[PDB]
Structures are given as structure tokens and as C-alpha cells.
Design a binder for these strands. Structure first.
Length: 246
DNA sequence: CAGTAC
DNA sequence: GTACTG
């Protein structure tokens, strides 16, 4: 009966195995026990009150409405901005556990300062209901993880991820956000073999390494306007997102 | 460390 | 395999 309890606790957002185990040793057995007695982070507190909803996958159609809600608000600030949903949605599978949204501008200048008031604009609609994390200091990009909910009767809370990237990095950002995770690992794993490096920011060549293969060199960054450029520079056949669902 | 994003 | 903040 311990294993199921570790399952129950691990399905709380923000809680993993180490926390589930600690909660078990404290004698906690139910979600009610956790809510009333355990020390929760604001994250864990939010994931616990949205436990059922976060546990339910969403239809592709509803993920569209979520992206468009983001898209419309973002563009109101600017016509130029691109709001492309990634992750499970872009890979084209029928259900989504979350909605990943990448945002950029063709020029590479107009994207700055939007992130802060885009989030503010969404909160006024009543769209955003909770915030999980913010990474304002992330290179030239910002990432937000929060909880939204579409207008209307009988609607569930959903996990929402927003990142804002420069057009110089829009390629590797999409390559990261669409995934999948296993797919991203394998591709970056191949980069180490070829003496390169792949991040959500850029693909880099001439990357130095030591005897034990630990990285000591930043390498030089190769310009990649789109997803096909990085695929080509890696000596690999391009694959569509649907083909990326590993 | 632990948990998370893909 | 990278890369964040908690």
C-alpha cells in the first residue's frame, strides 16, 4: 500500500519521489493529510488544489483556444509577434497535458518588454489563475509557467508555458519546445559525438572537450534561421514534428 | 539536492 | 542532454 501512496503524492506538481517518501515517513497517506499537515511550497500548494484537473489530458481543440487566447492578447500589443504552440500540440497528437507557446518577432527587437505586460494582460481577462515559476533572467529569453482557464461553464484548469525568444534563436527554441524529450536528448547526444552543442538558444560548433569528455570550450555559434538549418548542420535528414514524437 | 521544461 | 528556479 506504500507504492500507491508514493504515486498519489508524486502526481502533485512540484513534488517528486524524495518528497513523496518524506511525506510517507511522516505518516501521511492521503491528499487531505498533505494539505493540512505538510509543509508546501507555493508551487506544491497550487498543484494540490488543481490535482484532478492537472491529472486530466486536454483535447487538441481546447489547446487551440488556449493558444489563441494567448495569441490574441500578445498581438494586441503588437501585430508582428508570432505565437506558435509547441510540445504535444505541434507534434500533432490528439491530447495534450499542457500548452507550450513560443513567442518571437521577425525583426528581433520588438519582442522585448512584451513578456511582462502580456502576463499582466492575461491576468486581467481572468485567464491566468496561478503562477508557478518565472525565469526572467534566462539569456535573451524569458519563461513562464502558470495556470490558465478558458472562459465558460464547466472548464478545467490547465498548465500553460510561455517563452519569449529573439528571432536569432527562434529556430533552436522551437526545436526545444516541440520535443519530444527523448527526441531532444538523442539529438543533443549526437552533438557531443560530433563535437558540438545544442541548447534552446543556439547550435554551436568547434566545442572543446577534455579527456573525460567534460566540456571546457564554448565553441562558436552557427546561425540557424529555421529548424531545417540545424538539422542539416547536424548531418541529419529533417524530420517533421509529427515525426519527432519519440 | 530536488523538480521541472522539452 | 541542456537549462532553469525551489
Amino acid at each position: 500500500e506504500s507504492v500507491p501512496v508514493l504515486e498519489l503524492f508524486s502526481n502533485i506538481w512540484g513534488a517528486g519521489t524524495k518528497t513523496a517518501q518524506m511525506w510517507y515517513q511522516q505518516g501521511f497517506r492521503s491528499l487531505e493529510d498533505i494539505r493540512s499537515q505538510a509543509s508546501l511550497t507555493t508551487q506544491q500548494a497550487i498543484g494540490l488544489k488543481h490535482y484532478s484537473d492537472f491529472l486530466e489530458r486536454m483535447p487538441r481543440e481546447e489547446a487551440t483556444e488556449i493558444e489563441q487566447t494567448v495569441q490574441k492578447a500578445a498581438q494586441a500589443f503588437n501585430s508582428g509577434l508570432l505565437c506558435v504552440a509547441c510540445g504535444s500540440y505541434r507534434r500533432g497528437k490528439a491530447t495534450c497535458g499542457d500548452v507550450d507557446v513560443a513567442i518571437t518577432h521577425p525583426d528581433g527587437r520588438s519582442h522585448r518588454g512584451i513578456f511582462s505586460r502580456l502576463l499582466d494582460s492575461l491576468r486581467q481577462e481572468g485567464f491566468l489563475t496561478d503562477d508557478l515559476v518565472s525565469q526572467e533572467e534566462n539569456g535573451q529569453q524569458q519563461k513562464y509557467l502558470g495556470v490558465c482557464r478558458l472562459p465558460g461553464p464547466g472548464r478545467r484548469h490547465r498548465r500553460l508555458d510561455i517563452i519569449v525568444v529573439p528571432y536569432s534563436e527562434f529556430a533552436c527554441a522551437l526545436l526545444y519546445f516541440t520535443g519530444s524529450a527523448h527526441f531532444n536528448r538523442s539529438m543533443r547526444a549526437l552533438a557531443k559525438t560530433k563535437g558540438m552543442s545544442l541548447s534552446e538558444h543556439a547550435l554551436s560548433t568547434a566545442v572543446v572537450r577534455n579527456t573525460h569528455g567534460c566540456k571546457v570550450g564554448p565553441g562558436r555559434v552557427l546561425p540557424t534561421p529555421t529548424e531545417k538549418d540545424v538539422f542539416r548542420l547536424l548531418g541529419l535528414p529533417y524530420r517533421e514534428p509529427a515525426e519527432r514524437d519519440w
